[PDB]
């Protein structure tokens, strides 16, 4: 995390200065839970330290973004190698397929390759239950999940794979192109 030496697997769209600027962002992000002595390297940066700054509060996808970036167990989360590989997906120069693959992984909670009906409900409820979702506004998406899955499940298993997601979302890849960062 804090050193630039030990086995950095980063096949990525960032040149030598873009990595140095992103390393300075990761350095400002690093020190509150380990405040002065930087002891736990491939473990911090955590969701507590991502939640630390102003506009990471009513963004319903910030814990989803953290989980696709690294994570697996709680508190052992976004190391610097994860830190570069992630924003490389949103870099200018990065391909529409790696951005549509990231959009699939926001809906695919357990990362097994398939959007199940429960994981599509839990993602869409995370963004829709913010500005007063009353009982009819909850029932409209709780009925429309089953009907989106019934129509997009072309292969038969009752669960949306990456081929069936990209048949609805990016067969001509227009939505797949619109995922750019400012670095």
Coordinates of N, CA and C in Angstrom, one line a residue:
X1 N 0.8 -1.2 0.0 CA 0.0 0.0 0.0 C 0.9 1.3 0.0
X2 N 1.5 1.6 1.1 CA 2.3 2.9 1.2 C 3.7 2.9 0.4
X3 N 4.4 1.7 0.3 CA 5.6 1.6 -0.5 C 5.3 1.2 -2.0
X4 N 6.1 1.6 -3.0 CA 6.0 1.2 -4.4 C 7.1 0.2 -4.8
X5 N 7.0 -1.1 -4.3 CA 8.0 -2.1 -4.5 C 7.4 -3.6 -4.6
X6 N 6.7 -4.1 -3.6 CA 6.4 -5.5 -3.5 C 5.2 -6.1 -4.4
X7 N 5.6 -6.6 -5.6 CA 4.7 -7.4 -6.5 C 3.3 -6.7 -6.9
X8 N 3.4 -5.5 -7.6 CA 2.2 -4.7 -8.0 C 1.7 -5.2 -9.4
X9 N 0.7 -6.2 -9.3 CA 0.0 -6.7 -10.5 C -1.1 -5.6 -11.1
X10 N -0.6 -4.7 -11.9 CA -1.4 -3.6 -12.4 C -1.3 -3.5 -14.0
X11 N -1.9 -4.4 -14.8 CA -2.1 -4.3 -16.2 C -3.2 -3.2 -16.5
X12 N -2.8 -1.9 -16.7 CA -3.7 -0.8 -16.4 C -3.5 0.4 -17.4
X13 N -4.5 1.2 -17.6 CA -4.5 2.4 -18.4 C -3.9 3.7 -17.8
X14 N -3.0 3.6 -16.8 CA -2.3 4.7 -16.1 C -0.8 4.7 -16.4
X15 N -0.3 5.8 -17.1 CA 1.2 6.1 -17.2 C 1.9 6.4 -15.9
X16 N 3.3 6.5 -15.8 CA 4.1 6.8 -14.6 C 3.7 8.0 -13.7
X17 N 3.3 9.1 -14.3 CA 2.7 10.3 -13.6 C 1.2 10.1 -13.1
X18 N 0.3 9.6 -13.9 CA -1.1 9.2 -13.4 C -1.1 8.2 -12.2
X19 N -0.3 7.2 -12.2 CA 0.1 6.4 -10.9 C 0.6 7.2 -9.8
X20 N 1.6 8.1 -9.9 CA 2.1 9.0 -8.9 C 1.0 10.0 -8.3
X21 N 0.2 10.7 -9.1 CA -1.0 11.4 -8.7 C -2.1 10.5 -7.9
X22 N -2.5 9.4 -8.5 CA -3.3 8.4 -7.8 C -2.7 7.8 -6.4
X23 N -1.4 7.6 -6.4 CA -0.6 7.3 -5.1 C -0.7 8.5 -4.1
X24 N -0.6 9.7 -4.4 CA -0.9 10.9 -3.6 C -2.4 11.0 -3.1
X25 N -3.4 10.8 -3.9 CA -4.8 10.5 -3.5 C -5.0 9.4 -2.5
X26 N -4.5 8.1 -2.8 CA -4.4 7.0 -1.8 C -3.6 7.4 -0.5
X27 N -2.5 8.2 -0.5 CA -1.9 8.7 0.7 C -2.8 9.6 1.6
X28 N -3.4 10.7 1.0 CA -4.5 11.5 1.8 C -5.7 10.6 2.3
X29 N -6.2 9.7 1.5 CA -7.1 8.6 1.9 C -6.6 7.6 3.0
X30 N -5.3 7.3 3.2 CA -4.9 6.3 4.1 C -5.0 6.5 5.7
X31 N -4.6 7.7 6.3 CA -4.3 7.7 7.8 C -5.3 8.4 8.7
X32 N -6.3 7.5 9.2 CA -7.1 7.8 10.4 C -7.2 6.6 11.3
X33 N -7.7 5.5 10.9 CA -7.6 4.2 11.7 C -6.2 3.7 12.1
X34 N -5.2 3.7 11.1 CA -3.8 3.8 11.4 C -3.3 5.3 11.2
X35 N -3.4 6.2 12.3 CA -3.2 7.7 12.2 C -1.8 8.1 11.9
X36 N -0.8 7.8 12.7 CA 0.7 8.2 12.5 C 1.5 7.0 11.9
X37 N 1.6 5.9 12.6 CA 2.4 4.7 12.2 C 1.5 3.8 11.1
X38 N 2.0 3.7 9.9 CA 1.3 3.0 8.8 C 1.7 1.4 8.9
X39 N 1.0 0.7 9.7 CA 1.3 -0.8 10.0 C 0.6 -1.8 9.1
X40 N -0.7 -1.8 9.0 CA -1.5 -2.7 8.2 C -1.6 -2.3 6.7
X41 N -0.7 -2.7 5.8 CA -0.6 -2.2 4.4 C -1.7 -2.8 3.4
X42 N -1.6 -4.1 3.1 CA -2.6 -4.8 2.2 C -3.9 -5.2 3.0
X43 N -4.6 -4.2 3.6 CA -5.7 -4.3 4.5 C -6.5 -3.0 4.7
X44 N -5.8 -1.9 5.1 CA -6.3 -0.5 4.9 C -5.9 0.0 3.5
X45 N -6.8 0.5 2.6 CA -7.9 1.5 2.9 C -9.3 0.8 3.2
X46 N -10.0 1.0 4.3 CA -11.3 0.5 4.6 C -12.5 1.4 4.2
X47 N -13.7 0.8 4.2 CA -15.0 1.6 4.1 C -15.2 2.7 5.1
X48 N -14.8 2.6 6.4 CA -14.7 3.7 7.4 C -13.9 5.0 6.9
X49 N -12.7 4.7 6.3 CA -11.9 5.8 5.7 C -12.3 6.3 4.3
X50 N -13.0 5.5 3.5 CA -13.8 6.0 2.3 C -15.1 6.9 2.7
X51 N -15.9 6.4 3.6 CA -17.0 7.2 4.3 C -16.5 8.5 5.1
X52 N -15.2 8.6 5.4 CA -14.6 9.8 6.0 C -14.9 11.2 5.3
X53 N -14.8 11.3 4.0 CA -14.9 12.6 3.2 C -16.4 13.0 2.8
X54 N -16.7 14.4 2.7 CA -18.1 14.9 2.4 C -19.1 14.2 1.4
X55 N -18.8 14.1 0.1 CA -19.8 13.5 -0.8 C -19.8 11.9 -1.0
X56 N -19.4 11.2 0.1 CA -19.5 9.7 0.1 C -20.5 9.3 1.3
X57 N -21.7 9.8 1.2 CA -22.8 9.7 2.3 C -24.1 9.2 1.6
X58 N -24.9 10.1 0.9 CA -26.0 9.6 0.0 C -25.5 9.3 -1.4
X59 N -24.4 8.4 -1.5 CA -24.1 7.8 -2.8 C -24.4 6.3 -2.5
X60 N -25.6 5.7 -2.8 CA -26.0 4.3 -2.5 C -25.1 3.1 -3.0
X61 N -24.3 3.4 -4.0 CA -23.2 2.5 -4.5 C -21.8 2.6 -3.9
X62 N -21.5 3.4 -2.9 CA -20.1 3.5 -2.3 C -19.6 2.2 -1.6
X63 N -20.4 1.5 -0.8 CA -20.0 0.1 -0.4 C -20.0 -1.0 -1.5
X64 N -20.8 -0.9 -2.5 CA -20.7 -1.7 -3.8 C -19.4 -1.5 -4.6
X65 N -19.0 -0.2 -4.9 CA -17.7 0.2 -5.5 C -16.5 -0.4 -4.7
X66 N -16.4 -0.1 -3.3 CA -15.5 -0.9 -2.4 C -15.4 -2.4 -2.5
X67 N -16.5 -3.1 -2.6 CA -16.6 -4.6 -2.8 C -16.1 -5.1 -4.2
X68 N -16.5 -4.5 -5.3 CA -15.9 -4.8 -6.6 C -14.3 -4.5 -6.7
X69 N -13.9 -3.3 -6.2 CA -12.5 -2.9 -6.1 C -11.5 -3.9 -5.4
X70 N -11.9 -4.4 -4.2 CA -11.1 -5.4 -3.4 C -12.0 -6.7 -3.1
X71 N -13.0 -6.7 -2.2 CA -12.8 -6.7 -0.7 C -12.8 -8.2 -0.2
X72 N -13.9 -8.9 -0.3 CA -14.1 -10.2 0.4 C -14.4 -10.1 2.0
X73 N -13.5 -10.3 3.0 CA -13.9 -10.1 4.5 C -14.0 -8.6 4.9
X74 N -14.6 -8.3 6.0 CA -14.8 -6.9 6.6 C -13.5 -6.3 7.1
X75 N -13.3 -5.0 6.8 CA -12.1 -4.2 7.2 C -10.8 -4.4 6.3
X76 N -10.4 -5.7 6.0 CA -9.4 -6.0 4.9 C -10.0 -5.7 3.5
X77 N -9.7 -4.4 3.0 CA -10.4 -3.9 1.8 C -9.4 -3.3 0.8
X78 N -9.5 -2.0 0.4 CA -8.8 -1.5 -0.9 C -7.3 -1.2 -0.7
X79 N -6.5 -2.2 -1.0 CA -5.0 -2.0 -1.1 C -4.6 -1.1 -2.3
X80 N -3.4 -0.6 -2.4 CA -2.9 0.3 -3.6 C -3.0 -0.4 -5.0
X81 N -2.6 -1.7 -5.1 CA -2.9 -2.5 -6.4 C -4.3 -2.6 -6.8
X82 N -5.2 -3.0 -5.9 CA -6.7 -2.7 -6.1 C -7.0 -1.2 -6.4
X83 N -6.5 -0.3 -5.6 CA -6.6 1.2 -5.9 C -6.3 1.7 -7.3
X84 N -5.3 1.1 -8.0 CA -5.0 1.4 -9.4 C -5.9 0.6 -10.4
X85 N -6.0 -0.8 -10.3 CA -6.8 -1.6 -11.1 C -8.3 -1.2 -11.3
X86 N -9.0 -0.8 -10.2 CA -10.3 -0.1 -10.2 C -10.6 1.1 -11.1
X87 N -9.8 2.2 -10.8 CA -10.0 3.5 -11.5 C -9.4 3.4 -13.0
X88 N -8.4 2.6 -13.3 CA -8.2 2.0 -14.6 C -9.4 1.5 -15.4
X89 N -10.4 0.8 -14.8 CA -11.7 0.6 -15.4 C -12.5 1.8 -15.9
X90 N -12.5 2.9 -15.1 CA -13.1 4.2 -15.4 C -12.2 5.3 -16.1
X91 N -10.9 5.0 -16.3 CA -9.9 5.9 -17.1 C -10.4 6.1 -18.5
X92 N -10.1 7.3 -19.1 CA -10.2 7.6 -20.5 C -9.0 6.8 -21.2
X93 N -9.2 6.2 -22.4 CA -8.5 5.0 -22.9 C -9.1 3.6 -22.6
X94 N -9.7 3.4 -21.4 CA -10.3 2.1 -21.0 C -11.6 1.7 -21.8
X95 N -11.7 0.4 -22.1 CA -12.7 -0.1 -23.1 C -14.2 -0.2 -22.6
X96 N -15.2 0.0 -23.5 CA -16.6 -0.2 -23.1 C -17.0 -1.5 -22.4
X97 N -16.4 -2.7 -22.8 CA -16.5 -4.0 -22.2 C -16.1 -4.0 -20.7
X98 N -14.9 -3.6 -20.3 CA -14.5 -3.5 -18.8 C -15.4 -2.6 -17.9
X99 N -16.0 -1.5 -18.5 CA -17.1 -0.7 -17.9 C -18.5 -1.3 -17.7
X100 N -19.0 -2.0 -18.8 CA -20.2 -2.9 -18.7 C -20.0 -4.1 -17.7
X101 N -18.8 -4.8 -17.7 CA -18.4 -5.8 -16.7 C -18.4 -5.2 -15.2
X102 N -17.9 -4.0 -15.0 CA -18.1 -3.2 -13.7 C -19.6 -3.0 -13.4
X103 N -20.4 -2.4 -14.3 CA -21.9 -2.4 -14.2 C -22.6 -3.7 -13.8
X104 N -22.3 -4.8 -14.5 CA -22.7 -6.2 -14.0 C -22.3 -6.5 -12.5
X105 N -21.1 -6.3 -12.1 CA -20.6 -6.5 -10.7 C -21.2 -5.6 -9.6
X106 N -21.8 -4.4 -9.9 CA -22.7 -3.6 -9.0 C -24.0 -4.5 -8.7
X107 N -24.6 -5.1 -9.7 CA -25.8 -6.0 -9.4 C -25.4 -7.5 -8.9
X108 N -24.3 -8.1 -9.4 CA -23.8 -9.4 -8.9 C -23.0 -9.2 -7.5
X109 N -23.8 -9.2 -6.4 CA -23.3 -9.1 -5.1 C -22.2 -10.1 -4.7
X110 N -22.5 -11.4 -4.6 CA -21.5 -12.5 -4.3 C -20.4 -12.8 -5.4
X111 N -20.3 -12.0 -6.5 CA -19.3 -12.1 -7.6 C -19.2 -13.5 -8.3
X112 N -20.3 -14.4 -8.2 CA -20.3 -15.7 -8.9 C -20.5 -15.8 -10.5
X113 N -20.5 -14.6 -11.2 CA -21.0 -14.5 -12.6 C -22.5 -14.4 -12.9
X114 N -23.4 -14.4 -11.9 CA -24.9 -14.3 -12.2 C -25.6 -13.3 -11.3
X115 N -26.5 -12.5 -11.8 CA -27.4 -11.6 -11.1 C -28.7 -12.5 -10.7
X116 N -28.8 -12.9 -9.5 CA -30.0 -13.6 -9.0 C -31.1 -12.6 -8.6
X117 N -32.4 -13.0 -8.6 CA -33.5 -12.1 -8.2 C -33.4 -11.4 -6.8
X118 N -32.9 -12.1 -5.7 CA -32.6 -11.4 -4.5 C -31.5 -10.3 -4.6
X119 N -30.3 -10.6 -5.2 CA -29.3 -9.5 -5.4 C -29.7 -8.3 -6.3
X120 N -30.4 -8.5 -7.5 CA -31.1 -7.4 -8.2 C -32.2 -6.6 -7.3
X121 N -32.9 -7.2 -6.4 CA -33.8 -6.5 -5.4 C -33.0 -5.7 -4.3
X122 N -32.0 -6.3 -3.7 CA -31.1 -5.6 -2.7 C -30.3 -4.5 -3.3
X123 N -29.7 -4.6 -4.5 CA -29.1 -3.4 -5.3 C -30.2 -2.3 -5.6
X124 N -31.3 -2.6 -6.3 CA -32.3 -1.6 -6.6 C -33.0 -0.9 -5.4
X125 N -33.4 -1.7 -4.4 CA -33.8 -1.1 -3.1 C -32.7 -0.2 -2.4
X126 N -31.4 -0.5 -2.4 CA -30.3 0.4 -2.0 C -30.3 1.8 -2.7
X127 N -30.5 1.9 -4.0 CA -30.7 3.2 -4.7 C -32.2 3.8 -4.7
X128 N -33.3 3.0 -4.7 CA -34.7 3.5 -4.7 C -35.2 3.9 -3.3
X129 N -34.9 3.2 -2.2 CA -35.3 3.6 -0.8 C -34.4 4.7 -0.2
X130 N -34.5 6.0 -0.8 CA -33.8 7.2 -0.2 C -34.8 8.4 -0.1
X131 N -35.4 8.9 -1.2 CA -36.4 10.0 -1.1 C -37.9 9.6 -1.0
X132 N -38.2 8.9 0.1 CA -39.6 8.5 0.5 C -40.3 7.5 -0.5
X133 N -39.7 6.2 -0.5 CA -40.3 5.1 -1.2 C -41.6 4.5 -0.4
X134 N -42.7 5.0 -0.7 CA -44.0 4.6 -0.1 C -44.5 3.2 -0.6
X135 N -45.4 2.5 0.1 CA -45.8 1.1 -0.2 C -46.1 0.7 -1.7
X136 N -46.8 1.5 -2.5 CA -46.9 1.4 -4.0 C -45.6 1.6 -4.8
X137 N -44.8 2.6 -4.5 CA -43.4 2.8 -5.0 C -42.4 1.6 -4.7
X138 N -42.5 1.0 -3.5 CA -41.9 -0.3 -3.2 C -42.4 -1.6 -4.0
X139 N -43.8 -1.8 -4.0 CA -44.4 -2.9 -4.8 C -44.2 -2.8 -6.3
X140 N -44.2 -1.6 -7.0 CA -43.8 -1.5 -8.4 C -42.4 -2.1 -8.8
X141 N -41.3 -1.8 -8.2 CA -40.0 -2.5 -8.4 C -40.0 -4.0 -7.8
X142 N -40.6 -4.3 -6.7 CA -40.7 -5.7 -6.2 C -41.6 -6.7 -7.1
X143 N -42.6 -6.2 -7.9 CA -43.2 -6.9 -9.1 C -42.3 -6.8 -10.4
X144 N -41.7 -5.7 -10.7 CA -40.9 -5.5 -12.0 C -39.5 -6.2 -12.0
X145 N -38.9 -6.5 -10.9 CA -37.7 -7.5 -10.8 C -38.0 -8.9 -11.4
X146 N -39.1 -9.6 -11.0 CA -39.6 -10.8 -11.6 C -39.8 -10.7 -13.1
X147 N -40.6 -9.7 -13.6 CA -40.8 -9.5 -15.0 C -39.5 -9.1 -15.9
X148 N -38.6 -8.3 -15.4 CA -37.2 -8.1 -16.0 C -36.4 -9.5 -16.1
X149 N -36.3 -10.3 -15.0 CA -35.7 -11.6 -15.0 C -36.5 -12.7 -15.9
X150 N -37.8 -12.9 -15.8 CA -38.6 -13.6 -16.8 C -38.3 -13.3 -18.3
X151 N -38.2 -12.1 -18.7 CA -37.9 -11.6 -20.1 C -36.4 -11.7 -20.5
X152 N -35.4 -11.2 -19.7 CA -34.0 -11.3 -19.9 C -33.3 -12.7 -19.7
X153 N -33.9 -13.7 -19.0 CA -33.4 -15.0 -18.7 C -33.4 -16.0 -19.9
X154 N -33.1 -15.6 -21.2 CA -33.0 -16.4 -22.4 C -32.4 -17.8 -22.3
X155 N -31.3 -18.0 -21.6 CA -30.7 -19.4 -21.3 C -31.5 -20.4 -20.3
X156 N -32.5 -19.9 -19.5 CA -33.4 -20.7 -18.7 C -33.2 -20.8 -17.2
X157 N -32.0 -20.7 -16.6 CA -31.7 -20.9 -15.1 C -32.4 -19.9 -14.0
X158 N -33.3 -19.0 -14.4 CA -33.8 -18.0 -13.5 C -32.9 -17.0 -12.8
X159 N -31.8 -16.6 -13.5 CA -30.7 -15.7 -13.0 C -29.9 -15.1 -14.2
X160 N -29.6 -13.8 -14.2 CA -29.1 -13.1 -15.3 C -27.5 -13.2 -15.4
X161 N -27.0 -14.0 -16.4 CA -25.5 -14.0 -16.6 C -25.1 -12.7 -17.4
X162 N -23.7 -12.5 -17.5 CA -23.2 -11.3 -18.2 C -23.5 -11.2 -19.7
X163 N -23.6 -12.4 -20.5 CA -24.2 -12.4 -21.8 C -25.7 -11.9 -21.9
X164 N -26.6 -12.3 -21.1 CA -28.0 -11.8 -21.0 C -28.2 -10.3 -20.5
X165 N -27.4 -9.9 -19.5 CA -27.3 -8.4 -19.1 C -26.8 -7.6 -20.3
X166 N -25.7 -7.9 -21.0 CA -25.2 -7.2 -22.2 C -26.2 -7.3 -23.5
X167 N -27.0 -8.4 -23.6 CA -28.1 -8.4 -24.6 C -29.2 -7.3 -24.4
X168 N -29.6 -7.0 -23.1 CA -30.5 -5.9 -22.8 C -29.8 -4.5 -22.8
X169 N -28.6 -4.4 -22.1 CA -27.9 -3.1 -21.8 C -26.8 -2.6 -22.8
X170 N -26.0 -3.5 -23.5 CA -24.9 -3.0 -24.4 C -24.6 -4.0 -25.6
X171 N -25.6 -4.3 -26.4 CA -25.5 -5.1 -27.6 C -24.9 -4.3 -28.9
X172 N -25.5 -3.1 -29.2 CA -24.7 -1.9 -29.6 C -24.1 -1.2 -28.3
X173 N -22.8 -1.1 -28.0 CA -22.3 -0.6 -26.6 C -22.3 0.9 -26.3
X174 N -23.5 1.5 -26.2 CA -23.6 2.9 -25.9 C -23.5 3.3 -24.4
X175 N -24.4 2.7 -23.5 CA -24.2 2.8 -22.0 C -22.9 2.3 -21.5
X176 N -22.3 1.1 -21.9 CA -20.9 0.7 -21.7 C -19.8 1.8 -22.0
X177 N -19.9 2.6 -23.0 CA -19.0 3.8 -23.1 C -19.0 4.9 -22.1
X178 N -20.2 5.2 -21.5 CA -20.4 6.4 -20.6 C -20.1 6.1 -19.1
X179 N -18.8 5.8 -18.8 CA -18.3 5.6 -17.4 C -16.9 6.3 -17.1
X180 N -16.7 7.6 -17.4 CA -15.4 8.3 -17.3 C -15.1 9.0 -16.0
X181 N -13.8 8.9 -15.5 CA -13.3 9.6 -14.3 C -12.6 11.0 -14.6
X182 N -12.6 11.9 -13.7 CA -11.5 13.0 -13.7 C -10.4 12.5 -12.7
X183 N -9.2 12.3 -13.2 CA -7.9 12.0 -12.4 C -7.0 13.3 -12.5

